[PDB]
Amino acid sequence: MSLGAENSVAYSNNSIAIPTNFTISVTTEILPVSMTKTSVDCTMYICGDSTECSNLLLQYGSFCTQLKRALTGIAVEQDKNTQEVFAQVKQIYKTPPIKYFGGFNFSQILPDPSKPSKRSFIEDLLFNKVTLADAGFIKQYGDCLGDIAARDLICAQKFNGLTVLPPLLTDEMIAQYTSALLAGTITSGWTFGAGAALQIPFAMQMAYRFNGIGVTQNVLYENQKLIANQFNSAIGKIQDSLSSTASALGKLQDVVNHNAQALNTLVKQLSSKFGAISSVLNDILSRLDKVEAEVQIDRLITGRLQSLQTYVTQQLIRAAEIRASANLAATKMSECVLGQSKRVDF
Amino acid sequence: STECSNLLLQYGSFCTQLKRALTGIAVEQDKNTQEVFAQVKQIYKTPPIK
Amino acid sequence: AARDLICAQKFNGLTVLPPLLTDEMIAQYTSALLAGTITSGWTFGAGAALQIPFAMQMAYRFNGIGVTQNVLYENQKLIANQFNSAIGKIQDSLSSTASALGKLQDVVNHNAQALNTLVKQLSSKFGAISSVLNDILSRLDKVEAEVQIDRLITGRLQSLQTYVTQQLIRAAEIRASANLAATKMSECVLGQSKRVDF
Amino acid sequence: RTQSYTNSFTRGVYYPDKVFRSSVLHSTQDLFLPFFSNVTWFHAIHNPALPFNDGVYFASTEKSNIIRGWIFGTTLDSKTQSLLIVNNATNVVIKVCEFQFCNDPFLDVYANNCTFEYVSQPFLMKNLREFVFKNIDGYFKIYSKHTPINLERDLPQGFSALEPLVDLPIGINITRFQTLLALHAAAYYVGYLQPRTFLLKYNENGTITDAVDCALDPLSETKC
Amino acid sequence: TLKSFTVEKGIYQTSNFRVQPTESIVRFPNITNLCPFHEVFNATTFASVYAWNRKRISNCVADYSVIYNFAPFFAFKCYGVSPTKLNDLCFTNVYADSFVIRGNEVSQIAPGQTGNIADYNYKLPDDFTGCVIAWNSNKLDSKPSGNYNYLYRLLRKSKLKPFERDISTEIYQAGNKPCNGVAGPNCYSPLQSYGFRPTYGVGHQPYRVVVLSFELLHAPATVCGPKKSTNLVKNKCVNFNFNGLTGTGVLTESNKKFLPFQQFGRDIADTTDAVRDPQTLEILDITPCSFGGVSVITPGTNTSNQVAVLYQGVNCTEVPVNVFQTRAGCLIGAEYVNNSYECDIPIGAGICASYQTQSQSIIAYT
C-alpha cells in the first residue's frame, strides 16, 4: 500500500507563507442514532400453541421474563436516543416568507409546501437512497392473511412470534424538528440555542463567523458575492454527489441490514433438530409416548432458549454501540449547529 | 472425527454467527488503527537542517 | 525442545491474524505528523502546509494561552533548555521503569490468557466418561458414543460462546479507547486545545 | 464398438425432496451430478456393463423403438438373484429372476423362479431426454424431464430440473448395468453421480432455475 | 404478569390474545382392505436368517392391537416410534421380515451392532424407525435328534450393507489353494447348522424374530390405521389432523401450482403451510388464525383503575377471541381528542395517552 504522496515542505528561519484567497467547502457527516425495535414472544417461538410444551417450559423458570425485559429496555432506549438527539428546542421556529439571505439561498435544505411531508430536497434524496426492509412498523396481518404471490419473510417472522414495534416519533415530526432548527440557525444565528432567538441579517452573522476564526470582517464585506457563489456551488455539488453514488449512507444501510439478518437467523434456527428425532413438535407429540417425547421436547426447548439468548445478547451489544453513536451525534448536534466550535476536525 | 461433525451439523447455525462476530472484531481493529493514525494526506519530510 | 502454548493453540484451531498496517507504516505516519507539527504548526491539518520558523510558531502558541509573545523572544534560551531537560527526563523515566505501559501489557495478557483458557477447557469431561473423543469412539457402540459426543459438543459449544461474548465486550471497550485516542490526535497534535486537562 | 469421453458442460439436476418450497435457496446433501464431469458418449451399431458405483443416469436423443431397455444387475443368466428391468412401449416387467440369456444379449422380435413380479407405468414415451437411476437406501428413485434439443450436438448448457415420477424399490446388490436395445448409430450418454453439496435456486412456481456446486471453484464455495 | 399488586403509570405488555379452535377435522384416505398380519405372524415354518422373507404390506387398514393375540411375545420393542401410538398416526409402506435365531444373538438385531448375525446375515440401518419382536419357540422348533433345517452363514469376505441378503452357497476360500468344489483346508462351507435340542440352557433356545419395518409418510399414504374421517371445513380456525400430522390453523383455497409428485409445502422455518387432501385431489393453505400482542395502558393504582387495551398490529374489525384505529395497533377504552399536549404515556406513531379531567377518563392525542 501507499501511505500517501511525498511532500518536502520548504522550511527556513526567516521564511513565512501566507494565503491570498480562500475557498468555501461543504462536507457531509452521517451518524446513526437508532435502530429497529423488536418485541419477541418466547412462548410462541419455542412452543407454538402446544400445551404440554408450555407445561414443560414453566419448569425452566424466569428466562422469558428477563429476555422480554431486556428487549423492552432496548425498545425504550431507541426512542430515548432519538428524543435526545433531535428535540433540542422549546419552540418550532418558522422561516420568513422572503427568501433573501444576503446572496445565500437555502432552497435545497428548507422544506417545500408542495409535498405532503415537510421534507426538503436533500432529505428526499436521503430517504430515497436508503432501502429499508419494510418491516412490521405498519400493520401487516391483512397482507399476511391474504395469500398473494408467495410467502414473505416478514409474514414468517410475524407468524413465529417476532414483532417489530414502530417508533414514537414519525418522520414528519423529525422533519419539523429539522426545519425548526434550520430556520433558527439561518435567521437568529447561535442566539436561539442560548435563550431567546434574536434576529440578525445573515451577512452580518457571516461577518461574526469570519471574526471568530481569526479573519477580519472587512474581508467578507468586500467579497460577499464570491462567498455567496462559492457557498452556492459547494451546496450544489452535494446534490450531484448524492444523486449518483449510493455508497455514502452505508452506516445506516448496515444498521438496517444487521437487524434484518439477526431476525432471519432467529427464524432459521427453528429448523434444527438439536439432537432430537424431529424439528417439528407435533410429529414428536403424535409419534411418541409421554416420557420419551418429554425428553425430546426438553432438548428442543434448551436449543431454542439458547438461540433466543444469543439473539438477545447480540442485540444488547449492538444497542450499546448505537447508544454511543447517538451520544456522539447529539454532541455534534449541540456544538456544530447551535454554535461555533474551535475544536480541530470536530 | 466424522461422527462428531455429523452430529454437530444438527445444532443449526451456532458457528456462522461466531465466525461473523470474530470477523467483525478483526475488521474493527484495522478500522481503529486507520482511524487513529491515518490522519494526514501527504507524507511530510523534515528538512536536513536541525 | 518442548511443546509451546502457541503450538497447541494453533493445533487446536485457534489462529491469530496479523494486522494490516505494519509497525514501519505506523512509524512513517508518526514521523509525517511530527514533521508537519514541527514545520507548519496547525495549518497542515486545515489545508495546505504553510511554513513558519519554530520561534514564531512557539510565539503563536504563547499567544493562544493568553501570555503576550514578547516573553518568548526575551526567554528563548531558557525555554529551549527546559524543553531539552524535560525530553531527557522522559527518556530517563522510560529507561528506568516499565510500569507505565501496564495497559498495553494488559491488552497483550488478556488475549493470551483467554486463548490459554480456551485450550485448557478441552481437557474437561463435561459429565462424560472420557475427555478424549477417540476413546469414546473406540470404546462404545453407536448410541452411547453419540450420547457422550453430544455432551462433549454441548460443553465445547458453551465454552466457545463464552469466549466470543467476552471478545465482543473487550472489542467494544477497545473501540471506545481508540475513538478517544483519535480525538486526542485530531485536537492536541493538529491544533491547540483550550479544554482543561485534555 | 467405439467409445468417446466428452464433457457434459454443466447439465443435469433433479428435485431433491417431495415437498414444495417457493422463492428460497435450499442446500441439500445428495448423490449429485458433478459439474464439468467426464461423461462417455458411447457409440454402437451392432455393449459391456458399466461399473455402477452409488449413482448413474442416462441421456439419449434417439427416437422410435430402438431406444429401450435398461437391464440392471450384478450377473445375468443364472446363479445370483439380480434385477432385470426390461422396458417397451407400455410395460415394465420387474423381476428378480433371470431370463435365459447368453454371452450375447438380444431381444427377439419375430424366466427363472421369480420372487417379486411387479407391473407398473411405462418409463418412456429432436428430443434429448434425460433419465436418472439413482440408488440410495434400496429405493431406485427415477427423475426425468423432457428436453427438446434445438441443434443435434453434445450435452448443452442448462439447469432443468428432472421431476420425480417413479419410485420402485428393489433392495438388492447392483454393481453393473447392461443395456437392452431392440435388435432387428445410437447417440446415448453415460454419466456418473457423486455425493456433493448443492445450493438450488427456486422460484414462485417451484422450478430449479440455477444450481451451484460447492466444490467446483472457490468462488462457488464463497457463494455457498 | 408484573408479580405485584400495585402497578405504576405506563404501558405494559402482558400477554397475547389467540382465537381458540372450535372444531376438529380428521382426513384419512378411503381404504377398506385389512392388512395381512395373520399370514406373517401365524405360519407353519419360517425361513432361516440368511434367506429371510420380505413381505410388502400396503393399501389396507392396519390394526396393531390384534398383534398380541396372534403370537405370545412379551413386549413390542420399537426404536423410531413409541409402541403406544401406532394407530392414530399412519405411514406409507410396511415391510415384514422374519427369521429364527438363538437366544444369545437377540440384541444384535438393533441399529448399530456387531457380531455374527449383524455382520454376515442380517444388518439393521443407522436410523431404524420400525419395530422388532422376538419370543421363545422351544415347543414348535426343536427335536431330540436335532433341528438341521435352519442354517447361518459363519464366514464372508465383507460385512453386509443394511437390508441385504446373501443367498449364494459357494465354498468360502480363505487360502491360496483353489477350492473347485472341494471342501478341505481353508475351503469351508459358509452355512452351519444351529443344532437345536430341547435340553439346552436358557440362552440357547430358538427364538422367532419378526421385524415390522416402517417408513415415514411421503407422497403416497397407502397403509393407514383405523380412524373415522370428518367433512372438510374452510375459513375457520380449526384443528386439522391430515394423515397423522396434527396442528391448528385455517384452511383456504390455494393457487399454488403443485406438481403431481408434491404432497406438502414447507417454509424457511420448516413447518407445513400447504397440504394435499388424500380424498379429493386439492391443495389447502394452512395459516394460523388471528393473534397478536396485547398491551395494557394504565395510570397508577393510586389514581384510578381505568384501563385501555392496545391490540398491537391488527386492523381491528376482528377484535374478539371508544375504538380508535392507530398506526401502532388500535385502542379500546381511550377516546381521541382534537388537541395536542405533551406525551405522558407513549403508545405509537406520534400518539400518546393521558388521564385527565375535562368526569375523568383516558384520552388519546397526537
Ligand SMILES: *[C@@H]1O[C@H](CO)[C@@H](O)[C@H](O)[C@H]1NC(C)=O
Ligand atoms: C538560519 O538558517 C540558516 C540556514 O537556513 C543558518 O545558516 C543560520 O545559522 C540560521 N540562524 C541561526 C541563528 O542559527
Ligand SMILES: *[C@@H]1O[C@H](CO)[C@@H](O)[C@H](O)[C@H]1NC(C)=O
Ligand atoms: C437558489 O437556488 C434555487 C434553486 O436552485 C434557485 O431557484 C434560486 O434562484 C437560487 N437563488 C439565488 C440567489 O441564486
Ligand SMILES: *[C@@H]1O[C@H](CO)[C@@H](O)[C@H](O)[C@H]1NC(C)=O
Ligand atoms: C476425460 O478423460 C480423458 C482421459 O484421457 C481426458 O483426456 C479428458 O481431458 C477428460 N475430460 C475432462 C476432464 O473434461
Ligand SMILES: *[C@@H]1O[C@H](CO)[C@@H](O)[C@H](O)[C@H]1NC(C)=O
Ligand atoms: C455387493 O456390492 C459391493 C459393492 O461395494 C461389492 O463389493 C460386493 O462384491 C457385492 N457382493 C456380491 C456378492 O456380489
Ligand SMILES: *[C@@H]1O[C@H](CO)[C@@H](O)[C@H](O)[C@H]1NC(C)=O
Ligand atoms: C410461473 O408461471 C406463470 C404461469 O403463467 C408464468 O406466467 C411465469 O412466467 C412463471 N414464472 C417463472 C417461470 O419464473
Ligand SMILES: *[C@@H]1O[C@H](CO)[C@@H](O)[C@H](O)[C@H]1NC(C)=O
Ligand atoms: C394359524 O392358521 C391356521 C390355518 O389358517 C389355523 O388353523 C390356526 O388356528 C391359526 N393359528 C392361530 C393362533 O390363529
Ligand SMILES: *[C@@H]1O[C@H](CO)[C@@H](O)[C@H](O)[C@H]1NC(C)=O
Ligand atoms: C375416494 O374418494 C375419491 C373422491 O371422493 C374418489 O375419487 C375415489 O374413487 C375414492 N376411492 C375409492 C376406492 O372409491
Ligand SMILES: *[C@@H]1O[C@H](CO)[C@@H](O)[C@H](O)[C@H]1NC(C)=O
Ligand atoms: C385496514 O386498515 C386501513 C387503514 O386504516 C383501512 O383503510 C382499511 O379499510 C382496513 N381494512 C379493513 C377494515 O378491512
